[PDB]
Amino acid sequence: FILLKPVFHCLNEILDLCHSFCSLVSQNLGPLDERGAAQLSILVKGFSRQSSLLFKILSNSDLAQLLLRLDYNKYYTQ
Amino acid sequence: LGQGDFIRHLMDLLKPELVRPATTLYQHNLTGILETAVRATNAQFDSPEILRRLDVRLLEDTGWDVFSLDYHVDGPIATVFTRECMSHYLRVFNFLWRAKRMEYILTDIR
Amino acid sequence: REIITLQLGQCGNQIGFEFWKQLCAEHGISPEGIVEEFTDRKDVFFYQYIPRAVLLRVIHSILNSPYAKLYGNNWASGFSQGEKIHEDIFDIIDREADGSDSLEGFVLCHSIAGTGSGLGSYLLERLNDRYPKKLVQTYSVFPVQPYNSLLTLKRLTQNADCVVLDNTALNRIATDRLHIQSFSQINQLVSTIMSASTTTLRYPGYMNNDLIGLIASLIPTPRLHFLMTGYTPLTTVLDVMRRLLQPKNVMVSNHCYIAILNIIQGEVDPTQVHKSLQRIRERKLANFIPWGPASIQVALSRKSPYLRVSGLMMANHTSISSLFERTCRQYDKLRKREDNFDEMDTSREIVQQLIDEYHAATRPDYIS
Amino acid sequence: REIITLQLGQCGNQIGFEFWKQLCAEHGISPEGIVEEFTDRKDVFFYQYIPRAVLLRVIHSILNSPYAKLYGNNWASGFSQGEKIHEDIFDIIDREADGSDSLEGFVLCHSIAGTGSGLGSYLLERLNDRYPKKLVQTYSVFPVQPYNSLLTLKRLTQNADCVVLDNTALNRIATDRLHIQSFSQINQLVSTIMSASTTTLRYPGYMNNDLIGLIASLIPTPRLHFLMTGYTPLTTVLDVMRRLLQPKNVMVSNHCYIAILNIIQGEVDPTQVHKSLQRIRERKLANFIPWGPASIQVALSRKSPYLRVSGLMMANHTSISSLFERTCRQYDKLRKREDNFDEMDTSREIVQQLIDEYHAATRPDYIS
Numbered sequence: 016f017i018l019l020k021p022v023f024h025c026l027n028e029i030l031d032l033c034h035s036f037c038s039l040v041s042q043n044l045g046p047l048d049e050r051g052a053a054q055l056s057i058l059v060k061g062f063s064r065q066s067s068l069l070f071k072i073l074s075n076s077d078l079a080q081l082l083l084r085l086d087y088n089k090y091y092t093q
Numbered sequence: 094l095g096q097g098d099f100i101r102h103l104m105d106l107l108k109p110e111l112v113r114p115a116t117t118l119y120q121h122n123l124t125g126i127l128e129t130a131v132r133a134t135n136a137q138f139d140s141p142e143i144l145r146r147l148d149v150r151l152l153e154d155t156g157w158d159v160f161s162l163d164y165h166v167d168g169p170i171a172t173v174f175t176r177e178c179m180s181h182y183l184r185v186f187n188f189l190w191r192a193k194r195m196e197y198i199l200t201d202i203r
Numbered sequence: 204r205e206i207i208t209l210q211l212g213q214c215g216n217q218i219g220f221e222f223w224k225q226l227c228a229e230h231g232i233s234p235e236g237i238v239e240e241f242t243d244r245k246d247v248f249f250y251q252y253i254p255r256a257v258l259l260r261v262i263h264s265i266l267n268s269p270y271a272k273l274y275g276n277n278w279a280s281g282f283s284q285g286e287k288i289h290e291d292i293f294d295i296i297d298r299e300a301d302g303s304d305s306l307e308g309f310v311l312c313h314s315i316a317g318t319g320s321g322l323g324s325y326l327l328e329r330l331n332d333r334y335p336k337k338l339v340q341t342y343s344v345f346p347v348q349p350y351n352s353l354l355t356l357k358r359l360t361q362n363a364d365c366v367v368l369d370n371t372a373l374n375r376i377a378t379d380r381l382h383i384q385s386f387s388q389i390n391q392l393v394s395t396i397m398s399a400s401t402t403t404l405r406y407p408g409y410m411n412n413d414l415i416g417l418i419a420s421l422i423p424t425p426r427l428h429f430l431m432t433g434y435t436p437l438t439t440v441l442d443v444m445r446r447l448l449q450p451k452n453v454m455v456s457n458h459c460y461i462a463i464l465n466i467i468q469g470e471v472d473p474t475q476v477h478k479s480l481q482r483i484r485e486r487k488l489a490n491f492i493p494w495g496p497a498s499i500q501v502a503l504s505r506k507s508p509y510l511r512v513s514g515l516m517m518a519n520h521t522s523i524s525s526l527f528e529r530t531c532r533q534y535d536k537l538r539k540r541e542d543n544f545d546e547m548d549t550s551r552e553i554v555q556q557l558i559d560e561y562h563a564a565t566r567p568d569y570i571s
Numbered sequence: 572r573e574i575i576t577l578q579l580g581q582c583g584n585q586i587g588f589e590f591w592k593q594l595c596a597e598h599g600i601s602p603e604g605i606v607e608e609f610t611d612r613k614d615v616f617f618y619q620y621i622p623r624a625v626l627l628r629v630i631h632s633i634l635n636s637p638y639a640k641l642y643g644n645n646w647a648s649g650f651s652q653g654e655k656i657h658e659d660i661f662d663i664i665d666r667e668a669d670g671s672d673s674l675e676g677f678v679l680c681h682s683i684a685g686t687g688s689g690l691g692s693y694l695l696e697r698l699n700d701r702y703p704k705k706l707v708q709t710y711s712v713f714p715v716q717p718y719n720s721l722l723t724l725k726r727l728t729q730n731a732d733c734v735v736l737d738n739t740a741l742n743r744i745a746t747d748r749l750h751i752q753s754f755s756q757i758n759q760l761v762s763t764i765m766s767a768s769t770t771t772l773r774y775p776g777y778m779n780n781d782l783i784g785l786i787a788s789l790i791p792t793p794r795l796h797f798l799m800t801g802y803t804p805l806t807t808v809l810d811v812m813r814r815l816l817q818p819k820n821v822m823v824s825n826h827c828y829i830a831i832l833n834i835i836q837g838e839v840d841p842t843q844v845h846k847s848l849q850r851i852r853e854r855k856l857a858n859f860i861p862w863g864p865a866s867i868q869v870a871l872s873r874k875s876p877y878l879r880v881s882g883l884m885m886a887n888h889t890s891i892s893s894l895f896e897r898t899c900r901q902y903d904k905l906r907k908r909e910d911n912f913d914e915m916d917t918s919r920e921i922v923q924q925l926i927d928e929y930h931a932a933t934r935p936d937y938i939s
Binding site: 079082083084086087089090 | 845848849852859860861863864865866867
Binding site: 073074077078081082085091 | 121122124
């Protein structure tokens with residue numbers, strides 16, 4: 016999917032997304048109170064949006080991929 | 094539908110899916126079901142080449158109105174079918190699909 | 204879909220063993236359950252190859268035969284002993300049903316004449332209670348004998364979802380055109396019918412690819428579930444279709460048909476089939492029910508290359524009620540000649556309902 | 572990133588010695604701890620060769636083996652002695668830590684039955700105290716006996732960040748497929764189980780290059796940190812995955828899986844692997860949680876050329892809660908059959924919590 020622009024420009028957003036989240040958990044050792052929770056709910060509104068956004072994209076080669084993510088039909092409930 | 098043994102199992106597996114409306118239907122899910130049928134029935138003992146072309150297509154309601162097989166063919170053999178036999182087989186496949194679910198309904202009632 | 208076969212009593216095991224011997228040869232499967240080198244659907248009956256069989260003294264004759272690599276006389280005693288081993292024999296079936304991909308039915312091969320009569324009636328009640336969505340087709344065989352004959356008839360009229368083969372018509376055909384005068388010689392004739400009865404479930408055909416397809420076509424009402432067989436060659440399709448309607452071939456010792464199924468296992472011409480049915484309608488060789496629209500069905504098939512024109516007829520004839528009166532009448536003669544003995548008259552009561560059900564089926568107002 | 576092993580008690584020291592036997596023979600390392608002439612990255616389990624083992628009567632048997640160059644019964648009796656020699660053994664761990672480049676985890680091999688039960692309980696607490704940054708995986712073994720087992724659970728439920736091996740189920744595999752009626756024989760399967768459990772760590776691959784790379788997929792929440800194992804070879808990928816999920820092969824004595832891992836040590840063609848999952852998912856042969864999105868993990872490897880396709884499966888099944896009940900059920904019988912006796916009572920509470928967490932996990936609304 017390196018040449019397929021739409022998927023490569025959507026998963027890319029998922030890539031740097033985890034950098035922010037993983038840093039958020041590592042940049043402290045206490046509960047998410049000092050505007051961390053305020054920053055936490057920011058990404059889920061975009062991530063889960065980016066999550067189901069990808070879901071419509073796959074609905075030739077994606078059959079081998081979407082099968083693994085959909086083994087428990089969880090995205091079917093999304 | 095000249096096989097009969099394979100279409101029997103294929104109508105038992107698509108039952109839980111096609112009852113839902115077409116909006117929640119996505120092609121990438123049904124292929125795993127079709128591949129399961131070709132493995133269970135007697136159609137497994139078959140030439141691997143012709144099995145490479147047999148797939149699904151989604152006509153564009155309910156799941157029993159947009160499902161149909163395609164069997165695309167390209168290359169030299171495509172000069173015998175010429176995009177019109179494939180526009181006629183699908184015109185036939187609907188009448189053989191309806192007259193096949195109208196029977197498995199009537200053997201379920203019985 | 205799959206089908207697990209059950210064999211009960213001495214009659215079941217033999218005609219079952221001859222059934223598997225005929226089928227293992229039809230396919231390219233050597234007696235030691237190994238495929239020989241030398242397109243036919245063999246997953247319904249064989250498990251990847253091993254037959255899906257559940258056998259129930261005669262067993263030793265099977266274990267000593269070259270096919271070893273392939274696996275009282277009172278009805279009350281037969282019913283009692285099944286109650287004691289209920290969990291034992293139901294443990295080999297459960298795994299046989301579960302281990303199966305998607306179970307479809309339970310073919311039963313038994314004779315109503317001693318333990319297979321009782322133990323057969325017992326499993327028939329437990330099967331329906333355990334699974335209500337599983338078809339139970341029984342290849343019963345007709346022969347204190349009058350008692351046990353009708354007792355199972357009580358169970359076969361409410362439990363079994365669907366083929367009679369009476370030894371009297373087997374003896375007559377044996378002496379007529381086979382010159383036997385022997386159990387091992389009549390079994391060659393019944394197994395030829397069984398392997399031909401399911402000739403539309405071993406080969407991928409246009410229609411009748413499921414066991415519920417053969418059943419729901421003939422049986423119009425769940426009470427009228429007794430069928431008879433016809434098998435001529437012991438040439439055009441008109442010759443076969445005419446010879447099957449001769450009562451000299453029907454294996455049964457006003458009256459009319461309800462639905463007929465013809466099985467042609469040859470290489471016959473596929474366009475002349477409609478021509479034969481047309482001449483059948485003109486000469487009027489068969490009469491049907493007056494109430495509901497009934498037709499005759501004919502299906503072609505392909506013989507195995509490893510293993511000529513044949514033909515089989517499956518029909519639901521109202522004349523089958525005559526056989527029941529013979530069993531019914533003999534009982535009353537024994538009831539005047541000798542804990543509560545109330546199970547018999549209940550069976551006697553329910554079988555009389557079927558007989559009246561048949562005689563009312565041949566009237567122009569069978570409905571209600 | 573190196574991982575050191577710890578062996579306690581009779582069972583632990585016996586299987587670990589054999590665990591190395593299978594491991595050193597898997598590589599070209601002669602019993603005298605030197606490479607034989609005769610690719611395989613050996614940094615995780617060997618130092619330059621010497622294994623990173625820490626062992627604690629039986630040592631005489633090991634020192635008398637050709638491998639001389641390769642280096643109470645109550646829970647209270649075990650825990651008491653461990654505190655006394657605390658600083659003695661922790662010298663060994665410390666000197667082995669800094670001698671390692673980057674220590675990652677602490678494999679522990681012991682039986683919960685007697686000195687290993689208490690000493691392991693003492694270790695896990697102290698190990699978490701000094702080292703809070705180290706994973707702790709344990710190869711615990713299941714069988715006054717019940718009291719020792721329940722006390723270990725209280726420690727294993729909160730300390731060990733990550734397998735179960737029950738002898739009763741293992742012994743049943745012996746009489747069926749090995750016909751032993753012996754510890755030295757049932758242990759052989761453990762070595763095959765243990766060695767295959769960590770195959771992807773020693774052979775260089777794309778992923779699964781660390782213990783964290785394996786377990787992190789299975790355990791979703793720090794409360795559900797228990798696994799069970801499966802091993803088929805006792806030949807396509809579909810042949811393997813089918814034979815794994817059969818209940819006759821797993822090493823255990825509604826309910827559904829949480830995550831599944833598959834270890835393939837053969838040379839199978841990797842183009843069909845995604846096909847087997849398709850057919851397997853369609854067969855819907857195994858059930859899963861409805862709350863959390865997860866899948867089935869499959870990973871390839873290569874068999875040791877110095878030694879045909881094998882396969883092992885790692886499972887986190889909620890049915891393991893049943894085993895705990897038996898221990899708790901027995902203990903409650905003991906509490907009514909006979910310095911404060913409150914530590915056992917607190918553990919009794921905390922083990923009951925885990926049973927609820929599994930039971931609650933099979934619900935559509937386990938979360939919150």
